[PDB]
Amino acid sequence: GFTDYKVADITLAAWGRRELIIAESEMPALMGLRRKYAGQQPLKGAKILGCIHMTIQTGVLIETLVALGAEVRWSSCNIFSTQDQAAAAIAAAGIPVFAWKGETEEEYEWCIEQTILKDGQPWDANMVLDDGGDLTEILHKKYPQMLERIHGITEETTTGVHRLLDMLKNGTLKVPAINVNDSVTKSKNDNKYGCRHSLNDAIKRGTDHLLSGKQALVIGYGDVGKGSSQSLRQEGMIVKVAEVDPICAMQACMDGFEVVSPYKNGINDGTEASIDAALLGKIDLIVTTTGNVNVCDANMLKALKKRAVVCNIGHFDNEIDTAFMRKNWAWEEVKPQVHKIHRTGKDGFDAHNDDYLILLAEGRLVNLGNATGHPSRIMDGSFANQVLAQIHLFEQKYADLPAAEKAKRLSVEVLPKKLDEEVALEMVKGFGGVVTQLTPKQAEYIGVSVEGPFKPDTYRY
Amino acid sequence: GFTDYKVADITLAAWGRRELIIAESEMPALMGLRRKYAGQQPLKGAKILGCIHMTIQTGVLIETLVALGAEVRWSSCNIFSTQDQAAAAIAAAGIPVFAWKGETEEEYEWCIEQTILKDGQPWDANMVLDDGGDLTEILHKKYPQMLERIHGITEETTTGVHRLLDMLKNGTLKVPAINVNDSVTKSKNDNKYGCRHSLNDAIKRGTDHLLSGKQALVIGYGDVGKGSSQSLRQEGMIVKVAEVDPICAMQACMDGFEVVSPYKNGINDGTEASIDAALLGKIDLIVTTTGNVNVCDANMLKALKKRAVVCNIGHFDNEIDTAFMRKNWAWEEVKPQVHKIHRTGKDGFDAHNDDYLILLAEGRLVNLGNATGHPSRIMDGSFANQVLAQIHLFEQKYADLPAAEKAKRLSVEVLPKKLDEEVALEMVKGFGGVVTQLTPKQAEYIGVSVEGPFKPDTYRY
Amino acid sequence: TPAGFTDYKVADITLAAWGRRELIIAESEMPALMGLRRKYAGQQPLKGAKILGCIHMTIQTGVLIETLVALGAEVRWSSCNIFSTQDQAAAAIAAAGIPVFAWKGETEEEYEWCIEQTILKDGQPWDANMVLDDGGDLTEILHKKYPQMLERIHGITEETTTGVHRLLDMLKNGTLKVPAINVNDSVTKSKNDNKYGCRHSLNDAIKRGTDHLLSGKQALVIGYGDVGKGSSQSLRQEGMIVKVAEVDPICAMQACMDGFEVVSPYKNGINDGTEASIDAALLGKIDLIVTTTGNVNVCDANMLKALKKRAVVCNIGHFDNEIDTAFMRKNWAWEEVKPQVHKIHRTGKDGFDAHNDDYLILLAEGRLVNLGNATGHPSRIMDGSFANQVLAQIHLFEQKYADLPAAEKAKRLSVEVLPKKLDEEVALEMVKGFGGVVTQLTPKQAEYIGVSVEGPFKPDTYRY
Amino acid sequence: GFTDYKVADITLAAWGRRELIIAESEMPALMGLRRKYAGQQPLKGAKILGCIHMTIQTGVLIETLVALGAEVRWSSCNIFSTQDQAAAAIAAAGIPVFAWKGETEEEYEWCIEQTILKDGQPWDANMVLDDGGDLTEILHKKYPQMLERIHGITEETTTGVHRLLDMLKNGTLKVPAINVNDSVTKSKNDNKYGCRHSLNDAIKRGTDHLLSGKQALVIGYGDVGKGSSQSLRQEGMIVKVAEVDPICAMQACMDGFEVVSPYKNGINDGTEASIDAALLGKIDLIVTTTGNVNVCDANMLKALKKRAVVCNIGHFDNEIDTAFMRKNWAWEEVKPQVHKIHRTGKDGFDAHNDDYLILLAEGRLVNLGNATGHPSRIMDGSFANQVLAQIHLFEQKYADLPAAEKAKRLSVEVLPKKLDEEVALEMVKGFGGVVTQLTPKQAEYIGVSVEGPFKPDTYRY
Numbered sequence A, B, D: 001g002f003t004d005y006k007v008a009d010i011t012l013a014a015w016g017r018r019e020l021i022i023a024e025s026e027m028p029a030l031m032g033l034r035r036k037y038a039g040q041q042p043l044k045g046a047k048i049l050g051c052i053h054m055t056i057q058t059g060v061l062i063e064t065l066v067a068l069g070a071e072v073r074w075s076s077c078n079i080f081s082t083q084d085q086a087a088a089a090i091a092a093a094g095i096p097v098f099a100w101k102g103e104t105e106e107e108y109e110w111c112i113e114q115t116i117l118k119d120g121q122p123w124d125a126n127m128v129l130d131d132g133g134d135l136t137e138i139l140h141k142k143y144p145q146m147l148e149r150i151h152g153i154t155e156e157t158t159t160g161v162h163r164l165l166d167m168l169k170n171g172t173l174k175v176p177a178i179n180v181n182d183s184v185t186k187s188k189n190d191n192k193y194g195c196r197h198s199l200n201d202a203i204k205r206g207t208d209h210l211l212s213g214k215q216a217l218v219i220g221y222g223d224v225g226k227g228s229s230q231s232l233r234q235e236g237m238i239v240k241v242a243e244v245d246p247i248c249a250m251q252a253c254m255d256g257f258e259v260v261s262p263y264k265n266g267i268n269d270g271t272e273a274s275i276d277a278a279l280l281g282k283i284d285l286i287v288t289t290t291g292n293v294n295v296c297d298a299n300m301l302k303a304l305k306k307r308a309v310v311c312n313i314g315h316f317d318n319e320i321d322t323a324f325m326r327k328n329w330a331w332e333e334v335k336p337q338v339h340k341i342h343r344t345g346k347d348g349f350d351a352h353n354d355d356y357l358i359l360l361a362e363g364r365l366v367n368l369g370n371a372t373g374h375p376s377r378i379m380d381g382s383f384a385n386q387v388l389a390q391i392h393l394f395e396q397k398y399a400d401l402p403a404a405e406k407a408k409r410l411s412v413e414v415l416p417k418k419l420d421e422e423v424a425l426e427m428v429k430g431f432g433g434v435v436t437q438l439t440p441k442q443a444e445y446i447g448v449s450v451e452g453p454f455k456p457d458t459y460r461y
Numbered sequence C: 001t002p003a004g005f006t007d008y009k010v011a012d013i014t015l016a017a018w019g020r021r022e023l024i025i026a027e028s029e030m031p032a033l034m035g036l037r038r039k040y041a042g043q044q045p046l047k048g049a050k051i052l053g054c055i056h057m058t059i060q061t062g063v064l065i066e067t068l069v070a071l072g073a074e075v076r077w078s079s080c081n082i083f084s085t086q087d088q089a090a091a092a093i094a095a096a097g098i099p100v101f102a103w104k105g106e107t108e109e110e111y112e113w114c115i116e117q118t119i120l121k122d123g124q125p126w127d128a129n130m131v132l133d134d135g136g137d138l139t140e141i142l143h144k145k146y147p148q149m150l151e152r153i154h155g156i157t158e159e160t161t162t163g164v165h166r167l168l169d170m171l172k173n174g175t176l177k178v179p180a181i182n183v184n185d186s187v188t189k190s191k192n193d194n195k196y197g198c199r200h201s202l203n204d205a206i207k208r209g210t211d212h213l214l215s216g217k218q219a220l221v222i223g224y225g226d227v228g229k230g231s232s233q234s235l236r237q238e239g240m241i242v243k244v245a246e247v248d249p250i251c252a253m254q255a256c257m258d259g260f261e262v263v264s265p266y267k268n269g270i271n272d273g274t275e276a277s278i279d280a281a282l283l284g285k286i287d288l289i290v291t292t293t294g295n296v297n298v299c300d301a302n303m304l305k306a307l308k309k310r311a312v313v314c315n316i317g318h319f320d321n322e323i324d325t326a327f328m329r330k331n332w333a334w335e336e337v338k339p340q341v342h343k344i345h346r347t348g349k350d351g352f353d354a355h356n357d358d359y360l361i362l363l364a365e366g367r368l369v370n371l372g373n374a375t376g377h378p379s380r381i382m383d384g385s386f387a388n389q390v391l392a393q394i395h396l397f398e399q400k401y402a403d404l405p406a407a408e409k410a411k412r413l414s415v416e417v418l419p420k421k422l423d424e425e426v427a428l429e430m431v432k433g434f435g436g437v438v439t440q441l442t443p444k445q446a447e448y449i450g451v452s453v454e455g456p457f458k459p460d461t462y463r464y
């Protein structure tokens, strides 16, 4: 008589289960942690509030936490990123999950609140796993008594870590966190290669546009922008890159891209005259990758070539000024998560108007909104780190420490390099790769143990 | 009446000068420092012992130091890396330089010592610029009193930083140092993209072999291994990668390479039975990139496919067991720095034997030995960092400090990120790239100053 | 849908509005085809034409259908594959009052029924006088079962390599009854569609069907003609380690020089029918096999037994007999993951453990995977192919073969390609769609290389 | 006492021989022909006049013809393409060769005449092997009596075939010819992949410029233009492509290139106003690939970005208007085949002037002029076809036929596809590739013999 969930359609559960079983064979690091720790039950007693895209890959993460002893209550961290068959399979396994593709904003907040509350009162949570910081924020602002009993947060993504570091800096962070994003097997695997796989995937599912021979502009060249730029260049696009960071821009140049600014001389003074109209008028596709605000702004959108595609693969939709478009232009739904925005005016449009832009996922994360986000074998790395991070903070038991000891432990840390390497090793074996073992002489020669770690903590890969 | 030099052919000086004038137009960061600091003369009083490949690019570096006030005495840090027209142009400008392509080991040592000694007595040096640590070693072992006058060392490359760190840990480093290698505009510019440009260059010059369609094995996948693998893959080689570091091996898999070991299951027995003979029997080209010892060992060389090319682009020739090949196999010079190594025995070869390997540059740095090393526009980043590091240590005046201040400053440091970004910006402008300026609101949104630095010190790019 | 219109059969007519929105987008991606619509509309060159059409009922085909109708033609349409229809495209066409019989996921019986519904109107042969085909099935049915109808048909315009082969066989046997245009061998078809279309759509279909990471995995592409070239690139550009098999040494040479290792599934290349002939070590490392040949049983039963566990198997050539799926149906249990995705469990026939690890993933039951698991080629590519189709239909319809006396019929009974000038004109509209600018020769330059300033720019022997 | 030759330095012969021995192992199709036909001596009595770039690869071709029974007299078909060690090795073998790197035009004509005349009288020639048609033209215009006794011409390259067809059309062609260029194992191997290998090779040897991140403009996208554009794109250049043929331009678009014209709207009306100065002012490198005349004209040269590199990889130097540059601008030799062209005037130049272009090889084919042209394993295909073509025309004995029979055979033909395939099979085997054999049922299914040919003559590959 299990009813403690809310999903689009429970009858999709068998299909979700078939895909979970396939995904297990694509996730050797995650499944190796199941096998290694299931006897020991290191998460026995853990009660995890989880807020992360409810995909098939997140289903394997959830069932790994459960197989190691945890109970969980789960929601998605984006209104479009759930795969409904995945949510259905998790609900059908007796796991509380509140998630469906195509939530409204009010439904989004309600789903998170249903994980926090059970039977109308605070659940006895003692761990948090978050992607972007929304659940973390709600707990600090609205449920501080609950954080008193929480041992830690394990945060997935660059934007979430930034929000954690602001709270730490301000003295408002109440529990320690592990920055899962900055493991190498996360940031330089998921953020880069995952977007390489899934950006052109989403754009093809959304539009079925030929990409070869067309012009793209990628805003940002951090890990996501590097992977995005490659997603498009490998399809034959002519890709230009914008950056505020000259080091990242130097990389874009050396990687064979032309580095351009939307603004003359790079000076974003807020005027229409600032816009490089000749450049924007030739762009067929713009992608935002920054985690920053209003990097595809109203004046750029006015100057874009007719029928250009606009999308965002950073965490939040305010990279693009969609608010301006809602206020001024008429939206025509092509199909779910694909809209034509008619720049002819706000009240109605001609069905044969040629002066429109195509917006994907209403500006939300496009790889998850129009496709299925990153593939299982990439998320394997991210999610093995999540499990290791959950084990570490749960075993530390911050909430039970005296106040003076808490003060020594209140920080945002990454996992040790040695664990990062062990995750990577299982990923390499998943491809059939064979890592060589140093001889004792060779290990002495470079100053490392034969077992690693093989690099100093400052190494950038 | 200038005679304080030793080069191959002083009449090459006009040709060297024409190439230096071209190189200046390719090195906007270096030339920007020349313009910015010429008036201040920040290196007036500096007496720099320099040991680094006497290329055209190093000539621009040397003449930037001199233009900022320095005196120098120069040698090359490798017996095959000098460009003789560069050495001549520098000597013809009245600068002491002792360097030619094709030195013997004894001549190499004599050259360093001609920089250290002036008129048979130790020069009154007070600064050191080094690439690989040979000059640094000699000063510490053979001229330790000269280090009483020296304010610091600025070290170019990964292997030399390793050696500095060992002395630091042993208490044997006598003067502070700047690790120039680990600026991002050095390690992730020079070490990776320089080798991408110059590895296939050197193999083409040495052999004129078609690379497309042939099998390569790159040993190592750090920065040099990454750029080398791309040098070969972009020519159409089928590239396999070996690694001892699982994180680097994970990157190779995601970059689209098969990861293999020369040894069965990765276990280096020392026995012939441990060699994967089927794999090595198909390899047309092996390239070592590790900075480690004997990573292309005698049993691997015996197993390689007939007529395979063997080369090393790490800093020292002991990556490849060339001593085994000298002792046991007969060497045929094709032309300078290209030898066929006949596996038929030691006592003479047949001109038409088919069982030989081709060794480039006798196993020394192949891009410098068989071509011209990295191009000017890439060395621009490395050498701008060198100049900044020289100004910083010279101004700190370590040797003039009380012993109390000395212990506090005796360290191996990197340049601050702000300077790294300023170097990157000049490189970007040299491609005609335009970096965007953050608005106040955007800078506040991501927590940075509009002028940078744009990333925390932990960021990996 | 016009009042009283029931002459169609599609999955769901309520998908029509969606299809129409996608048709309007596709028009903006198809400048060559829409340039013909604009150039020839007032002339109505297909007035009186009655075209039986058999080709994948996609959005791209919808723009083709509506261009023919806009030029005067009547049509009756079916798909040439049981999984290639886009149901919203079919609904939009049915809702414009155009007879179409097509949906995604037909049985073989339904497939044949659909073609027959184009041929028969109200239980009697329609008065067709033109044929547009993709693969030769409609052509074969007409020749075998309705020969009298070919008496009124002025020609066939055939889309694809496999269908051209079948026409040339009939021509060689004296059994082709009407002239045909080989649309496939326009350069703006073969070297555009067959190659770049599969580049776009092969990795697309594999992602949609499996969501597998492809970077760092091992692929084997069987064949390296135009489809094999595009397919290999689709996978290599994703980071796959791609090996190529070929029987043609010249195509194999191109694969070597393009940076691929060239291998055979069989020891020394010799396929003697024994298990001992299979290179088991090679096949046991392959994560993905793609067949591209137009040939039979190039991924045979002994290969399927030796493939690495959990490898993906698919076919992007025209017919499903590239892979021995009959063997898998006879011997192994099929698990449907979702439509057009099956796990084939090699442990036995009449059951499988839900957690079995010894299965293969077969996409689209061995049928054209780009069309079965994604949407086939993109509009801007099909633009080339379908502008040639329109030109070819105009040319045979104006030639009026069925009206000529016996004397001029023997003269005109041929299989021909479009002239190069027309190929260039299609290409020029494609280039302009990318915003490309073609340079004009000066008179002295045109004289120097011996062409007119207006072209054609190459001899007919030129290979591009 | 062999003196019937003229080369730069006969003492280079030993080095040239070493490189020939390496090249033989890189040329399996050609050495397969040696082994297959040596006992038959199918060219016994052939006396071949040869005019083609005197490289190591041509040396293997010459000695294959000689091995099959031919005598030859040889010259190069370009003033800068000879490798002097290859010329020396051939002369030292007793083979008449007249060729060196850096001929004047008068020397170039004298060298061809030295092949035509032996001891001041027409040699008893009976075969012609040509590259570009210069020897063919001289024989028709000045030595018609020799052509009465010549059985045929085997012509290497697009431009020479064009010249032959013009003669055939005008009725001035005196002997039949085989178009070697249009074997697939020539045109779609040599013309494309050869230039892919050797264009960036020459540019690096000439300038040592970084290419990644810079802007290139390739004029033409036939086989040479396709391979040249890949040569640059694979180095990270941003490549734009110009074309007059819309089908080739469509291919460039689909291959991921932006297709532009030097002229506004592509109309070359001869006025400076017609030049797209904005576009050309951004180009760092222009490469001509057309076989046409003046496709990099005076107004384009005036408009190119300062310090742009200019080169031609088509057969003749009139693709670039170098005449204009000699008449108006001052030339500064950097090193052989590398010139700065100072656009400040004809009247000398300032050594530090910034307004120059770098011209490679004085506008002659840059891959052979500034490097070594195509690699052995690629030229293997072209030269196995040359050998088969010589055998075919020599055995047909056209000169010995009655006039009515000559009239039936006077044509320009290609080799049969079966031989094209047999050449390709040897090439594939040299890479270790394994071609599959059709079963009888499969061969029946697709309508071919198990032995091939596998494609109809109309197939384009």
Ligand SMILES: NC(=O)c1ccc[n+]([C@@H]2O[C@H](COP(=O)([O-])OP(=O)(O)OC[C@H]3O[C@@H](n4cnc5c(N)ncnc54)[C@H](O)[C@@H]3O)[C@@H](O)[C@H]2O)c1
Pocket (backbone or CB within 6 Å): A157, A158, A159, A160, A190, A191, A194, A195, A219, A220, A221, A222, A223, A224, A225, A242, A243, A244, A245, A248, A289, A290, A291, A292, A295, A313, A314, A315, A316, A365, A366, A367, A368, A373, A374, B436, B438, B442, B454
């Ligand atoms: N969709 C996905 O699957 C996915 C995956 C990982 C991360 N993310 C999100 O993507 C965003 C980027 O993450 P990251 O790891 O690449 O961060 P990052 O810090 O490595 O890169 C962001 C880059 O944007 C640049 N940038 C900032 N403002 C800019 C502006 N105005 N114009 C141009 N460039 C600008 C910065 O210089 C930086 O290099 C974050 O929101 C992160 O959470 C999404």
Ligand SMILES: NC(=O)c1ccc[n+]([C@@H]2O[C@H](COP(=O)([O-])OP(=O)(O)OC[C@H]3O[C@@H](n4cnc5c(N)ncnc54)[C@H](O)[C@@H]3O)[C@@H](O)[C@H]2O)c1
Pocket (backbone or CB within 6 Å): A436, A438, A442, A454, B157, B158, B159, B160, B190, B191, B194, B195, B219, B220, B221, B222, B223, B224, B225, B242, B243, B244, B245, B248, B289, B290, B291, B292, B295, B313, B314, B315, B316, B365, B366, B367, B368, B373, B374
């Ligand atoms: N030739 C050049 O122009 C040039 C340029 C820069 C640096 N270098 C030299 O190249 C070397 C590498 O420098 P780097 O910056 O890439 O260092 P790095 O530490 O980034 O990379 C070296 C890599 O080798 C791997 N490795 C070590 N031992 C191995 C073994 N037995 N088998 C396989 N892989 C193994 C390590 O795991 C590491 O990833 C150093 O000697 C450095 O000084 C040469």
Ligand SMILES: NC(=O)c1ccc[n+]([C@@H]2O[C@H](COP(=O)([O-])OP(=O)(O)OC[C@H]3O[C@@H](n4cnc5c(N)ncnc54)[C@H](O)[C@@H]3O)[C@@H](O)[C@H]2O)c1
Pocket (backbone or CB within 6 Å): C160, C161, C162, C163, C193, C194, C197, C198, C222, C223, C224, C225, C226, C227, C228, C245, C246, C247, C248, C251, C292, C293, C294, C295, C298, C316, C317, C318, C319, C368, C369, C370, C371, C376, C377, D436, D438, D442, D454
């Ligand atoms: N799915 C699509 O969108 C699409 C697009 C165009 C064409 N097609 C179809 O794809 C198929 C191939 O078309 P194409 O234009 O590339 O033809 P093609 O003749 O250019 O190429 C087929 C290749 O297969 C090779 N081959 C034959 N038997 C083989 C074997 N046993 N092993 C290995 N290689 C073998 C041939 O040597 C040839 O090079 C045809 O059925 C055509 O109708 C499909």
Ligand SMILES: NC(=O)c1ccc[n+]([C@@H]2O[C@H](COP(=O)([O-])OP(=O)(O)OC[C@H]3O[C@@H](n4cnc5c(N)ncnc54)[C@H](O)[C@@H]3O)[C@@H](O)[C@H]2O)c1
Pocket (backbone or CB within 6 Å): C439, C441, C445, C457, D157, D158, D159, D160, D190, D191, D194, D195, D219, D220, D221, D222, D223, D224, D225, D242, D243, D244, D245, D248, D289, D290, D291, D292, D295, D313, D314, D315, D316, D365, D366, D367, D368, D373, D374
């Ligand atoms: N350097 C080498 O090693 C080498 C190798 C092979 C051939 N070649 C020579 O290279 C040249 C080209 O040979 P190919 O086989 O590529 O010929 P091709 O006919 O395949 O290509 C030449 C191209 O130039 C284009 N073109 C003509 N005039 C033009 C103009 N004004 N602007 C732009 N594009 C224009 C044509 O449309 C055509 O596509 C010939 O001279 C040939 O002999 C040189």
Ligand SMILES: Nc1ncnc2[nH]cnc12
Pocket (backbone or CB within 6 Å): B052, B053, B055, B057, B058, B194, B368, B372, B373, B374, B375, B379
């Ligand atoms: N061209 C170059 N000059 C100096 N040091 C180098 N290290 C690598 N390439 C170099």
Ligand SMILES: Nc1ncnc2[nH]cnc12
Pocket (backbone or CB within 6 Å): C055, C056, C057, C058, C059, C060, C061, C197, C371, C375, C376, C377, C378, C382
């Ligand atoms: N999208 C498509 N529509 C019709 N026929 C096709 N053949 C390949 N892709 C196609």
Ligand SMILES: [K+]
Pocket (backbone or CB within 6 Å): A055, A057, A372, A373, A374, A375, A376, C211
């Ligand atoms: K996914």
Ligand SMILES: [K+]
Pocket (backbone or CB within 6 Å): B055, B057, B372, B373, B374, B375, B376, D208
């Ligand atoms: K250099």
Ligand SMILES: [K+]
Pocket (backbone or CB within 6 Å): A208, C058, C060, C375, C376, C377, C378, C379
């Ligand atoms: K499509």
Ligand SMILES: [K+]
Pocket (backbone or CB within 6 Å): B208, D055, D057, D372, D373, D374, D375, D376
């Ligand atoms: K060569």
